[PDB]
Design an enzyme around this catalytic site. Structure first.
Site, PDB file in Angstrom:
ATOM      1  N   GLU A 106       4.626   5.155  -3.878  1.00 21.93           N
ATOM      2  CA  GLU A 106       4.983   3.806  -4.291  1.00 21.93           C
ATOM      3  C   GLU A 106       4.521   2.809  -3.237  1.00 21.93           C
ATOM      4  O   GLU A 106       5.214   1.861  -2.868  1.00 21.93           O
ATOM      5  CB  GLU A 106       6.480   3.678  -4.563  1.00 21.93           C
ATOM      6  CG  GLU A 106       6.957   4.359  -5.832  1.00 21.93           C
ATOM      7  CD  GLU A 106       6.398   3.756  -7.116  1.00 21.93           C
ATOM      8  OE1 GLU A 106       6.938   4.073  -8.197  1.00 21.93           O
ATOM      9  OE2 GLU A 106       5.452   2.946  -7.059  1.00 21.93           O
ATOM     10  N   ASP A 107       3.322   3.073  -2.738  1.00 26.70           N
ATOM     11  CA  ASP A 107       2.675   2.196  -1.789  1.00 26.70           C
ATOM     12  C   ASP A 107       3.529   2.012  -0.546  1.00 26.70           C
ATOM     13  O   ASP A 107       4.063   0.939  -0.279  1.00 26.70           O
ATOM     14  CB  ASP A 107       2.344   0.865  -2.449  1.00 26.70           C
ATOM     15  CG  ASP A 107       1.708   1.047  -3.808  1.00 26.70           C
ATOM     16  OD1 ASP A 107       1.006   2.063  -4.002  1.00 26.70           O
ATOM     17  OD2 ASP A 107       1.916   0.184  -4.686  1.00 26.70           O
ATOM     18  N   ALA A 108       3.696   3.094   0.193  1.00 30.28           N
ATOM     19  CA  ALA A 108       4.092   3.032   1.588  1.00 30.28           C
ATOM     20  C   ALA A 108       3.045   3.821   2.355  1.00 30.28           C
ATOM     21  O   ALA A 108       2.478   4.770   1.813  1.00 30.28           O
ATOM     22  CB  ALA A 108       5.493   3.592   1.798  1.00 30.28           C
TER      23      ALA A 108
END
Lengths: 49, 306, 67, 46, 66, 107
Positions: free
Chosen positions: C19-21
């Site tokens: 989740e876009d980290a």
């Protein structure tokens, strides 16, 4: 799975996934909650390491 | 199980090249989880000296002063790390034993008698590319009695720092200290430290005919020596060590099984690249020393608790 | 020019990244990866509040608490 | 010792002392800077 | 702004090759050859010069010169 | 000023207990372990790193018989250090060998 020792077959989306008739699904129904949660976290850790 | 002599029969350390600021030596016969420990100890543990406190007098350049202060830290002192103590907690002054002390001052002006041209500033200017040879060591107490000349100095006398135009000047007064490689990143005594396992190219078939062309292009620069026992080129490996696993053999549907790419189990190859604080040999030695000393610490603690 | 280059390796090495980290080496963040600074320039005029006399800004003659 | 300033457009000191205009007593243009006093100051470099 | 001291990825000292870079430029090498002769092998150090753009030789012109 | 400390298991004592080093990494806790492993009397030996923003590890050791784990522990430390000693000897020997050789080559 027969007496807690998987014998054939993968673990696919169904069981550790949140659907009816899953592994963490049924664990919770008959053992309580805390043990199902512990199963989830520990299994995830193994899966990362 | 474990047995000293069985092992010690096997271990050997072959060197393949050393020059200044370079090293390359085969550690054939040790188990991964020790080689990894050597590499880690290098990149993180061999202590070094560096700049950690800059005092400003009258910065009037374009380069804002915070950024000059941090752009200093990366500069490597060329002095001995073994002849000091960890700075005792606090005490910005400290002692002799826990400090160097440098100084920088480059007040700039015009060119006294410049021609008409105004082509390059070197003819138009003096002190407009502040280098590091404008730094000069200062002694503290008995540093003179302690060290000879020509040692205390940054390592290159070529590292550009700033840029001035007539009217602007700087005045620093550094403060050097001791530390380790994991407390920060301006302490790594080496550029790189790695190890790859010797690759082992075994022809599961004798390759022949005209394959030589594509094989010789399937691999690293010199690996397969086209050999002509009868004027007809055949292939054999010149050096299986000189390759990086291009793995560009598989794209040919045919030459996917007439060869075999793999690794020899334990044939590590370090390679150390020092910055210049010490030549790589003393580096390896010091790494091993600190491992052994750590273990001694733990053991003696276990002893003195019982 | 608007941004600064970087080396990407795309692997699920930690779990952390989803989740876009994303994770960034701490060293090459000490060595200077896109450090920033902002200039905020507040502005003041003492003519804003209308007072008596020739109020302009200066440290008074009075001994200011010598901090 | 006393306060110093510089005119913007021509760069020639102006040294505002009294209660007075804010114009560079030579340079017609008028907007001012300040000048740097040599001081000591601590600055870490981690 | 000005050339950084130590490379980003690995840690080499790169805060000096700039001058010799322009040098081997005037001798007309195609940059691939220049960064070779300057002794840089792993690419993560080469993109530190093949793509730096200097902003003090274009920013000093506004100098409050005297 | 602890630098080694053990918490005694509830289940049993001194054949399964678990250690808590301080100030460490994956260097020791991944060399020491591999060293202990060779010992055949031990059942279980594994390690973890309790906390990323701290630097202390956790060592778990379990043994068949009734002798406590202090014995395998200590013998592992000793094994490792003697190893490193030999390695360093061979290292420096080889260093000076090739150095004097290189000098001899170009004279």
């Amino acid at each position: 799975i027969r007496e807690g020792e998987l014998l054939c077959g993968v673990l696919d989306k169904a069981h550790y996934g949140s659907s009816a008739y899953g592994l963490v699904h049924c664990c919770y129904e008959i053992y309580g909650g805390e043990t199902s949660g512990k199963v989830l976290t520990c299994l995830a850790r193994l899966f990362t390491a | 199980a474990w047995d000293q002599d069985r092992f010690e029969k096997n271990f050997r350390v072959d060197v393949v090249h050393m020059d200044e600021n370079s090293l390359e030596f085969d550690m054939v016969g040790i188990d991964a989880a020790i080689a990894n420990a050597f590499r880690r100890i290098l990149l993180a543990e061999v202590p070094t000296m560096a700049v950690e406190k800059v005092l400003v007098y009258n910065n009037t350049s374009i380069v804002q002063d915070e950024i000059l202060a941090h752009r200093l830290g990366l500069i490597p002192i060329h002095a001995d790390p073994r002849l000091f103590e960890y700075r005792n907690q606090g005490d910005e002054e400290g002692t002799e034993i826990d400090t160097l002390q440098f100084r920088l001052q480059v007040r700039c002006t015009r060119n006294p008698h410049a021609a008409k041209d105004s082509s390059d500033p070197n003819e138009l200017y003096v002190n407009h590319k502040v280098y590091t040879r404008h730094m000069t060591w200062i002694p503290l107490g008995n540093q003179a009695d302690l060290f000879p000349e020509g040692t205390i100095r940054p390592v290159h006398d070529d590292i550009l720092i700033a840029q001035l135009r007539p009217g602007q000047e700087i005045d620093l007064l550094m403060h050097c200290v001791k530390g380790i490689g994991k407390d920060h990143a301006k302490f790594s005594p080496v550029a790189t430290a790695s190890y790859r396992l010797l690759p082992d190219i075994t022809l599961l078939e004798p390759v022949e005919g005209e394959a030589a062309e594509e094989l010789s292009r399937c691999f690293s620069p010199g690996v397969i020596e086209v050999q002509e026992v009868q004027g007809k080129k055949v292939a054999r490996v010149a050096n299986p060590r000189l390759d990086t696993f291009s793995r560009e053999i598989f794209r040919n549907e045919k030459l996917k099984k007439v060869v075999r790419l793999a690794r020899v189990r334990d044939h590590y190859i370090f390679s150390v690249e020092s910055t210049g604080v010490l030549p790589p040999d003393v580096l390896v030695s010091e790494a091993i020393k600190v491992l052994m000393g750590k273990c001694r610490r733990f053991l003696d603690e276990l002893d003195a608790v019982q | 020019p608007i941004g600064t280059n970087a080396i990407v390796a795309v692997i699920s090495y930690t779990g952390y990244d989803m989740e876009d980290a994303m994770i960034v080496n701490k060293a090459s963040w000490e060595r200077g990866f896109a450090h920033g600074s902002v200039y905020k320039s507040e502005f003041i005029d003492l003519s804003e509040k209308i007072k008596q006399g020739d109020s302009s800004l200066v440290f008074g003659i009075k001994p200011g608490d010598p901090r | 010792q006393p306060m110093i300033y510089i005119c913007g457009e021509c760069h020639t000191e102006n040294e505002i002392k009294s209660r007075d205009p804010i114009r560079c007593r030579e340079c017609g243009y008028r907007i001012m800077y300040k000048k740097r006093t040599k001081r000591l100051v601590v600055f870490d470099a981690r | 702004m000005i050339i950084p001291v130590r490379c980003f990825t690995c840690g080499k000292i790169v805060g000096n090759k700039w001058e010799a870079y322009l040098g081997l430029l005037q001798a007309e090498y195609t940059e691939g050859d220049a960064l070779d002769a300057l002794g840089l092998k792993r690419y993560c150090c080469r993109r530190m010069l093949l793509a730096h753009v200097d902003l003090i030789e274009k920013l000093l012109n506004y100098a409050p010169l005297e | 000023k602890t630098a080694l400390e053990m918490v005694q298991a509830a289940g049993t004592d001194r054949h399964c207990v678990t250690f808590v080093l301080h100030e460490e990494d994956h260097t020791l806790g991944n060399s020491l372990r591999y060293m202990i492993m060779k010992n055949p009397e031990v059942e279980f030996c594994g390690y973890t790193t309790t906390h990323p923003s701290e630097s202390k590890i956790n060592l778990r050791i379990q043994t068949r018989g009734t002798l406590p784990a202090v014995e395998p522990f200590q013998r592992g430390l000793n094994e490792l250090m003697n190893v490193c000693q030999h390695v360093l000897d061979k290292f420096e020997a080889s260093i000076k060998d090739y150095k004097d050789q290189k000098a001899s080559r170009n004279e």
